[PDB]
Amino acid sequence: DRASFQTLIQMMRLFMYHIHLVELLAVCTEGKNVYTEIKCNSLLPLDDIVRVVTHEDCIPEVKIAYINFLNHCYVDTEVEMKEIYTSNHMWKLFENFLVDSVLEKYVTEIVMSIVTTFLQTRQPVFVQLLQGVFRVYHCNWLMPSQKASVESCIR
């Protein structure tokens, strides 16, 4: 809230685990109704916008994706919106459907999180092409992945 950095040394290479737990809690269930409204209230505290804005509280090892659960407030979407889904819809919305953890996250969140398509508007498509290009992983974005990235760029 005001003291968002209880971690050091990339969360012990501990703090990272706590951050991960918060992210997991956010993933839990989210956004829409009465229970969804309670989740939305938690989301309001998070300010999806605040979360997008911040990461200087600590330095984790593989804990950079403790806020990737921003694709569960699309059910009873009007209710989710009523709770507040637009409070982080500038950074967190731009990261969900951005290309067409974060490389694989755009293809499912573009097909799961109800957002718009994301010239001077084409960076997501360029990012998708780069994702398709990588070969250091265990076949992460093959030809199909590249095609998906191209589709995202076209969107």
Q: Which DSSP state fits 141?
A: S
**Per-residue DSSP letters for 52-103?**
HH--TT---SS-TTTT--TTS--SSHHHHHHH-GGGGTTTHHHHHT-----T
Neighbours of 119 (CB within 10 A): 5
- Number of Cβ atoms within 10 Å of the Cβ of 96: 23
Neighbours of 126 (CB within 10 A): 12
CA–CA separation, 133 vs 143, rounded Å? 9
State how far the Cα of 131 lies from the Cα of 118, in Å rounded to an integer: 16
Tell me the structure's resolution in angstroms, rounded to a single decimal.
4.1
Q: How many residues does the chain have?
A: 155
CA distances from 45 to 32, 103, 139, 152 (A): 16, 27, 38, 31
Technique behind the model: cryo-EM
The structure tokens 């250091």 sit at 136
Contacts of 154 (CB under 8 A, 6+ apart): 100, 125
d(CA 7, CA 89): 27
Give the C-alpha separation, 74 to 114, whole Å.
6
